[model samples]
Target chain A: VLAHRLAEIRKALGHARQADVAALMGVSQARVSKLESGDLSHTELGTLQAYVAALGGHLRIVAEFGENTVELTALEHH
Target chain B: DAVLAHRLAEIRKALGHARQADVAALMGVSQARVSKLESGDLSHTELGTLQAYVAALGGHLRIVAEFGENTVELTA
Candidate 1:
């Protein structure tokens, strides 16, 4: 679902294609294919971050424990 | 990374409603994998994996994207 939303954001608003994502991500189309495969059971969080970055967006991870939630911007190594 | 790892391990211990094996069952991962995750072995691990693990720990993992200043969420 995250991958779908990301792909939708790229294609619908950024008006970018899979090839464009590959170019922005500096990875082969094959790798992009994996990223967009809709099955993210093995896709690394950093890879997702890169995918979003290519769409001119940055990822923010927030961990919530009960009434407390903290923003962990350091989760991604970029 | 250490902070995140420590927090996760600490919470798991605090809950004590379970251990690694219990967590693995809930997370749909092998117990050893849960151990590795708790031990800070995050290399190449899946985002969905993390999501499930965190959720199993009774925590919410919220992922959002920020462009310029605006942001949108993509969570499980």
Candidate 2:
């Protein structure tokens, strides 16, 4: 499940390589590769956000139960 | 943010009035960090911290990607 999601995120990186993502996130290329191909069941939310940020994207978490939908991301009021 | 705060409060209550300090201890974070998180003062909090906090409280975190009418669970 998460593997596909990670792949999707990576695919959205367009032409950016693992090394480019590593430079953006201040991690090694190997670490970026690991995160891209590793199990994210235990990954931190911040880590995922960083990954998305590296791709010039934002991470938004939406929780839904029954008829209620809650947004957990911080508000952006620029 | 208010909804998240309410949910965290409810979770704490469900755990028999677990204190902020207790959650901090369980998550290996400072009490202040837990307090801020519970208060919805998470401007500086990382998603990883939030996940750890919930996991320490016997809850699981799942991410879902939504596209139009389709939704995919991002859990491993």
Candidate 3:
């Protein structure tokens, strides 16, 4: 699944300008806007990777195929 | 990420553990129809019907929405 937009993180960081972040990430401003809006049901994985990377974050994948699915641990970020 | 495509595949395997034919019978659909749905080949299903199927499997859906965070309006 795509990462849900954590808008509060951006807001708390004072990164309120979507256009500026879009420019920094080499994506259209509209896309950056969508990322913050939680319109991720149709987002591409590659785009999400680039976005999280630009935000100084990392991504992980967890796959469960059977019953009694166990929770996974989170990755620590510096 | 378009996880629906992946989820569809995973759910198809899951149905195998429960016997697709039996689930198909519960839904009153043909076994072939269930196969198609599990394979992500079926289209145009109502949300209510989808909810019914998910409920049968003891699953719940969660939806999230964020509004003003996406707009480009300048804050004073």
Candidate 4:
């Protein structure tokens, strides 16, 4: 799912390659490839958020605790 | 998560099966490179490339995402 979105973002943003995005984000090209390919199983949440932000996307985390109650809110943009 | 770890372990094992020379021949890398991969000591492989290698070894990789349930706090 994230990989699909990343591809969409790439097309939408007119980015040439993951290496270009990585250059924009100041990370290694391989890092961008990893994210676009959905190999972020071991990545920290903060890092993922940073990547999303670098792509001009924001993460919204909606979580619930107990009794199946659900609450939704946008995360604070850094 | 379990699937990813299991598949990676399987890949490492299969790479172990190939003799050092044979693995080097198949992967076009040095015997030492194959040894490092089997030993999980290689640093140059990107994550996607590693997954591809696992698939090449007939292993499937799956990733699962979950929220909450487990939390650890570390203060140093």
Best by TM-score: 1
Where model 3 places Cα greater than 4 Å from the true spot, the runs are A1-5, A13-17, A61-78, B1-76
Model 2, span B1-76: residue lDDT tens = 2245333445455545557788889999898877777775333444466567666766655565443444445554
Which scores higher on lDDT, 1 or 4?
A: 1
| Native-to-model Cα distance after best TM-score fit, residue B30 in candidate 3, in Å | 12
Extract clashing residue pairs from model 4: none
For residues A2-77, write the lDDT of model 2, one tens digit per residue. Answer: 5365666566445677888899988888778878787664555556667666767565565443243344554221
Tens digits of per-residue lDDT for model 3, B1-76? 1233233335434445556776677777798876776664212332344444544444533322222343221110
- List each candidate's DockQ score: 0.39, 0.23, 0.06, 0.02
Score candidate 3 by TM-score against the native.
Answer: 0.40
Positional deviation of residue A25's Cα in model 1 after best superposition, in angstroms:
1.5
**Tens-digit lDDT string for candidate 4 (A1-78):** 333345555555445577666876788987777767754445543454455556555533222222222221222223
TM-score of the second chain, each candidate in turn, equals 0.57, 0.64, 0.50, 0.42
Residue B37, candidate 4: Cα error in Å is 29
The CA lDDT of each predicted structure is: 0.68, 0.60, 0.46, 0.43
In model 4, which regions exceed 4 Å deviation? A1-5, A13-16, A64-78, B1-76
lDDT of 1 by residue, B10-68 (tens): 54665457678888999887888778777763434577777787788778777788877
Candidates, ranked, lDDT: 1, 2, 3, 4
What is the DockQ score of candidate 3, to 2 decimals?
0.06
> Which residue pairs come into collision in candidate 3?
none
Candidate 2 is graded, for docking, as: incorrect
Per-residue error at B8 for model 3, in Å?
Answer: 7.3
TM-score per model over all chains: 0.72, 0.53, 0.40, 0.37
Sort all candidates by DockQ, best to worst.
1, 2, 3, 4
